[PDB]
């Protein structure tokens, strides 16, 4: 009884996230197709993603519950098509700002994908099923990225004939998204805890750390293109993304295998791996060798993902399934309020308008200041 909704919910998850041209985005943008100056991408287009993502988060979170979780899933499917239909033919600098906004709906509606299964699957097969619908996404992204650097290198497929394949992939996602059973009970609508010492402190790092992780992911392909232009030398942005994603996936699984009490050795394991993220972000900025810059991304994603798993594990030890959403819903919002404050000052055109050359000395110093205040706070 639990296999039909999950089989079609996993098929939708795999196809939607099997997008080959996620890595080859900025090489595609600032190329001979939609030639855009790197100053028109790092300070006018990309920042809009965090502005629209922040705005369309609470309205979508509340909407997902009132109207049962599926209608929002379809909306994410439609926004996937609109985003890649403008990314194919839409040209200009103003048309790309619209694309970023529609990618806010695509990413902000991801809450209704993971939370849907709770309302249609029996409560016993909730962690079993949740793993199935979460590992398929990682296997889809890793499989897609490997294919991107398999057609661009061995098959010679232009960067345009990856948005066509990406469009077909997401276009088939919105064919299974019409077949999920319609839930009949929501969590809050149709169905003080922060005072705990651990749930607040362990949420502060989750909110702050994930705020910088999203920013680094956004303005990273510009750094690769800056240290080695795509029109002059070969770019392995697909293999690097695939290896980094696999590195994070195995790292998160490792935390779920070792049995160590993350209470006496929890804070130390988060200061130490936060230093590694600060140390490996100066490398991406201080190193001229493009290969070293790839390794800096490889270590950062693998190291950071080893901490979001500890923080998520420590946050969720007493909360119910009915409390994760509004305890992981605030943090995913407070994390964005930090990102918008940082993007406005550091990146936005009206702010400091810092280029990408000097930006990573701030992100690399951002994670070195989330270490002193969570290590100098432990005072006796």
């Amino acid at each position: 009884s639990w296999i039909y909704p999950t089989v079609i919910l996993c098929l939708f998850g795999f196809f939607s996230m099997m997008r080959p041209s996620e890595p080859f985005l900025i090489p595609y943008l600032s190329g001979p197709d939609k030639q855009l100056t790197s100053a028109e991408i790092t300070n006018e287009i990309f920042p809009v993603w965090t502005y629209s993502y922040l705005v369309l988060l609470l309205p979508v979170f509340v909407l997902t519950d009132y109207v049962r979780y599926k209608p929002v899933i379809i909306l994410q499917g439609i926004s996937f098509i609109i985003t890649w239909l403008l990314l194919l033919f839409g040209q200009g600098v103003k048309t790309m700002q619209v694309v970023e906004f529609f990618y806010g709906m695509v990413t902000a509606a991801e809450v209704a994908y993971y939370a849907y299964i709770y309302s249609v699957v029996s409560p016993e097969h909730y962690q079993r099923v949740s793993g199935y619908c979460r590992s398929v996404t990682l296997a889809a992204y890793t499989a897609g990225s490997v294919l991107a650097q398999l057609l661009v290198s061995l098959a010679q497929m232009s960067y345009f004939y990856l948005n066509v394949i990406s469009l077909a992939s997401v276009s088939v996602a919105f064919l299974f998204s019409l077949f999920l059973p319609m839930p009949k009970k929501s969590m809050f609508f149709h169905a003080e805890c922060y005072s705990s010492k651990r749930l607040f402190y362990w949420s502060l790092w989750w909110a702050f750390a994930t705020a910088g992780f999203n920013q680094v992911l956004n303005y990273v392909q510009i750094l690769w293109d800056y240290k080695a232009p795509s029109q002059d030398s070969s770019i392995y942005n697909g293999a690097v993304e695939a290896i980094a994603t696999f590195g994070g996936a195995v790292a998160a699984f490792a935390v779920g295998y070792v049995k160590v009490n993350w209470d006496l050795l929890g804070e130390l394991a988060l200061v130490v791996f936060s230093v590694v993220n600060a140390g490996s972000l100066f490398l991406m900025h201080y190193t001229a060798n493009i290969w070293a810059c790839y390794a800096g991304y490889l270590i950062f994603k693998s190291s950071y993902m080893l901490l979001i798993t500890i923080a998520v594990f420590q946050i969720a030890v007493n909360l119910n399934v009915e409390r994760y959403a509004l305890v992981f819903g605030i943090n995913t919002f407070i994390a964005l309020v930090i990102q918008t404050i940082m993007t406005v000052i550091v990146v936005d055109q009206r702010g400091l308008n810092l280029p990408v050359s000097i930006q990573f000395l701030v992100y690399g110093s951002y994670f070195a200041v989330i270490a002193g205040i969570f290590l100098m706070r432990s005072m006796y």
Partner: nanobody
Amino acid sequence: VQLVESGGGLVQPGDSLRLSCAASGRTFSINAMAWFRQAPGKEREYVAQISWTGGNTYYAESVKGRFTISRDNAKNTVYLQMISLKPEDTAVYYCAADSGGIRLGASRWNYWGQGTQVTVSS
């Protein structure tokens, strides 16, 4: 926008040139203007760019350091200043005015100029 180019001519090597582009007709919305170039028996080649709202520029790697592009929003014209010319720069230059708005198309540059003849020789 009806871009008109002028200022072409044959110059001995090491002689600069200034090329203007009297953009006119719908100049309220021209969010860029990037000169191009088409050498004899070749294809159009990027040569410069200048934003209209601000002044951000982006020159081609080969031509950077001698080619200076400056907007003149008062009169709408866009000037390309070139120094240290050589007989390998003989080509024809074209403007390309990115009008603006939400559009679907094949090329970012909506409207194009006619073309000015530059013939470096001696």
